[PDB]
Design a protein around this ligand. Structure first.
Ligand code: HEM
Ligand code: HEM
Ligand code: HEM
Ligand code: HEM
Ligand SMILES: C[C@@H](c1c[nH]c2ccccc12)[C@H](N)C(=O)O
Ligand SMILES: C[C@@H](c1c[nH]c2ccccc12)[C@H](N)C(=O)O
Ligand SMILES: C[C@@H](c1c[nH]c2ccccc12)[C@H](N)C(=O)O
Ligand SMILES: C[C@@H](c1c[nH]c2ccccc12)[C@H](N)C(=O)O
Lengths: 244, 244, 244, 244
């Protein structure tokens, strides 16, 4: 492979040129995964494939950075945990962009023709990025919870410390764990956003949009499972404890 | 008003300077709507206010452009309708950014303190942008539907024509109405996205995140009402007619 | 209930009508600034105005948050200053989205016709939002620099501590000042981004693209001034110190 | 099931295991390109690699869609070409998000340490994605220009018809070529955007910010070359023709 074409003018996609850019990145191995253009069953199949691969790359990186967050949290390196969660959120937002590409540009008619030939078994439930992100979420939450325990703080404390008008006592440690909580909440909101945009996409490709009233019922229910349910519970606590 | 301050160094927000930039835009009238800083009950109130105003400005512009789309559709100016829907989508994406600003940076504790003093009657159900966008959606859909009728096309036709591999007959008119449908679908997906991001925001401020299992039940149901339900019905039709 | 348009098919109206949602937001004042439809030179005039207004609301709010950041830095409330800079950054990203709206949807031919009917002397150099943002950048930088001095820290020390591999000394205060630094650099990068997208927009409307070899030469040179030039200087010193 | 990491607490593993979802996507091949954890110089190396890989997947897909656009333009399938350019634009926006990820989260100090352990001759000038995109821009522009000729149209005619106020002649083919033009200009603006954000990123890592008065001078001059310089020339001619 020096190219994924054979006929052309300047239309040839030249790659595998031995540059150290390609060597450092292992770009030829990555480009090797694309369905060769001699085996595409549809002009839109590549687009379908590439958006999945971009997502899976972002999700494996999210996993990696969450493992680092656990290390930082277990060693009280709270400022360094913050950066890991912020980076994970940025990567999650790429997966959102990627599924919205399908919503905006994948023709339902192409998808139905393609799907009418799939192994009728290819389900995103088997996605490694998704399964592993779900697994690592429990250790991640445990590490944050124990850090809050060791500091002698309650979740209501770190939540309240985000408000400049809140007058209770603070330390450098409690405000750092506040920043961590806020960054974890933003990551979780971004993953929930992915689930909601993936839903909108599915309604536009397989039907089932609920305003009118293919295992859509389980999908709609799974689409509201948070990464960190304890953060959302704490939000609900604050409403009941502080509201009027 | 030459300023929204009184004490300062270079910290003064100088405005109302008579420039023709300000005159053309009526910027002094717009800046006049901000709660004066002598009457703010909380440092986060301005942020709350400004994100609403940005949204309402985008929604009134969406309304304006949809009225233009109706004109173009009623006169068979399909290429010009496309641009109106594309512009409306871009504006809708601003409202999404704006509600995600609250999710990411509005402290729940500030909101609860602020809300603990609101007229306990200020509901987004009274939003002019939202109500008027809901009203105009029916005329908008009617105008598109009649245009498809006059051309002698079915919705399944315009949907199928988005796929390059589809072999049925096309005209310039049918592919133009295909582009219009696609742009309308993207607008509707963006408004559904707003409703979903507004939901995530509310779960993070008032609780009620459904994975754990304040009129949240009606909100969750209204959050799946589409602007153009007939487009989503047609997506469901295509699944049943073309799938295996 | 008022009305931004008069002779219509009734379902194509917009309304302004005294609810508490509108009262709390001063919404009727804000919508009052829109150019009346009885007075529009061109159908694209509303769009032109609204993207400016959205931008100006974002910039006035940026200023308000930078003032709060100055207050936090002067009192050594470093964690609280971080949140202010991050909020400013997200507001800045709304201005980027607003100017790209014009790049993507404002027809050059409507801009040229509108520029003829428009006061020849109206210029964005008179933006209150842009002008006050440049004025407030000086005290913001001073407050950060003073806070770093009081802590007895080196700006190069602050930069190095963002790296997990860095082995030198860390306190809680130095790592907090590190997070402030990074948040400040993200804000400045966002504003540079605005300047760059505004340039791309001007090239597509008034011509002047530099690769082809009306106050353009100043605009390009102005487009490279940072809000916090010292942070970019500090980035240059670190390269000579560690990358040669 | 394989594993991108070995000695762990079991819930912190990543897996690769033969489902049809993985088979259809060639996912195991694609994840194989990630640098093994046993071989990473620095914890920020994975992040560095993944943002490049995501970018390169996006660019190879852009190329594939531009090839399709050439095919559509050569056969006068103008509506179909529009969809290809819009898809390319959204893919380009993923590359922008990917490089801003480095601007916002890659520590300069890790980049300098990593740049030392890295082959001194590796350069983005050898990007297959970037290189093929520049090569394919020439036939893309030719196909568009030829299509406009065959229609007997003026590029200024095509520009004017984007305006709803324009009164001159319009056919279905001229307005289709107008939509193609606008989609092409949005793509080029997106790529200019990438170049500008890449510059901002380089300034924050290698120094070199131009407002402070290592192949920087070429990079800045390269950052202003468009993919379709004729469209920007055409924008300049329209200003002299109509804005003086
Ligand atoms: C970037 C593209 C996509 C990615 C990364 C992706 C990923 C996923 C993931 C992770 C799940 C498990 C979701 C959960 O448990 O909440 C899932 C399920 C599902 N996906 Fe997607 N998906 C993509 C595109 C699509 C498309 C284009 C369709 C159909 C047109 C689709 C249809 C479904 C359905 C019906 C389910 C649930 C039932 C089932 O597993 O078959 N997905 N997908
Ligand atoms: C940019 C900011 C916001 C905008 C433009 C906005 C707008 C709206 C709109 C249009 C509705 C009607 C929704 C529907 O029928 O589906 C609504 C309802 C609602 N909003 Fe939001 N909202 C904003 C922020 C908030 C915040 C910060 C909260 C609470 C923390 C909130 C709580 C609610 C609730 C509970 C409802 C439904 C029940 C009710 O009307 O009280 N909103 N809002
Ligand atoms: C959409 C909202 C817009 C905003 C908020 C805005 C704001 C600004 C600002 C703040 C400046 C000063 C730049 C600096 O000093 O670095 C400026 C200058 C300039 N703007 Fe924009 N602008 C907008 C749209 C436009 C449009 C549509 C044009 C169309 C030609 C334009 C053309 C120019 C030019 C040529 C300058 C350079 C100085 C001058 O000739 O007045 N701007 N604008
Ligand atoms: C994140 C993904 C990145 C991609 C996809 C990428 C791609 C590229 C491309 C395509 C060029 C050629 C530009 C042109 O010819 O106009 C280039 C040049 C360059 N890149 Fe980036 N780049 C990335 C990250 C970085 C980073 C982190 C640095 C850090 C210093 C960097 C530094 C440079 C420099 C200095 C040049 C100019 C020529 C040279 O010295 O090699 N790039 N890069
Ligand atoms: C689950 C979904 C699918 C989602 N992502 C996929 C990737 C490769 C193959 C198939 C898929 C599949 N098209 C479905 O309709 O269920
Ligand atoms: C409906 C929501 C509200 C939403 N947007 C608002 C604007 C101004 C005043 C109040 C609101 C309100 N805070 C609530 O909790 O119901
Ligand atoms: C500076 C620019 C302008 C930019 N923003 C504006 C707002 C209102 C009136 C004019 C403007 C103006 N159109 C120009 O061509 O110089
Ligand atoms: C050109 C740039 C580089 C940019 N992208 C890369 C990918 C792999 C290795 C190196 C690079 C490189 N770091 C440099 O400083 O020149």
């Amino acid at each position: 492979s020096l190219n994924p074409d054979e006929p052309n003018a300047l239309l040839s996609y030249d790659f595998d040129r031995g540059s150290n850019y390609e060597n450092v990145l292992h770009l030829t191995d990555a480009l090797g995964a694309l369905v060769p253009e001699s085996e595409t069953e549809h002009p839109d199949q590549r687009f379908f494939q590439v958006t999945h691969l971009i997502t899976e790359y972002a999700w494996v990186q999210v996993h990696y950075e969450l493992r680092r967050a656990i290390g930082h949290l277990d060693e009280d390196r709270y400022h360094q945990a913050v950066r890991m969660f912020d980076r994970a959120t940025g990567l999650s937002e790429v997966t959102v962009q990627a599924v919205r590409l399908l919503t905006d540009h994948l023709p339902q008619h192409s998808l139905l023709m393609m799907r009418n030939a799939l192994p009728e078994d290819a389900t995103g439930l088997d996605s490694p990025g998704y399964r592993n992100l779900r697994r690592v979420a429990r250790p991640v939450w445990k590490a944050y919870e124990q850090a809050v325990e060791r500091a002698g703080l309650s979740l209501q404390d770190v939540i309240a410390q985000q408000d400049d008008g809140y007058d209770g006592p603070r330390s450098g440690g409690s405000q750092s764990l506040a920043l961590v909580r806020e960054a974890m909440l933003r990551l979780d909101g971004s993953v929930l956003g992915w689930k909601q945009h993936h839903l909108i996409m599915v309604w536009s490709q397989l039907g089932g949009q609920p305003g009118l009233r293919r295992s859509l019922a389980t999908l709609e229910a799974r689409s509201q499972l948070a990464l960190f349910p304890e953060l959302w519970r704490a939000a609900e606590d604050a409403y009941w404890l502080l509201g009027t």
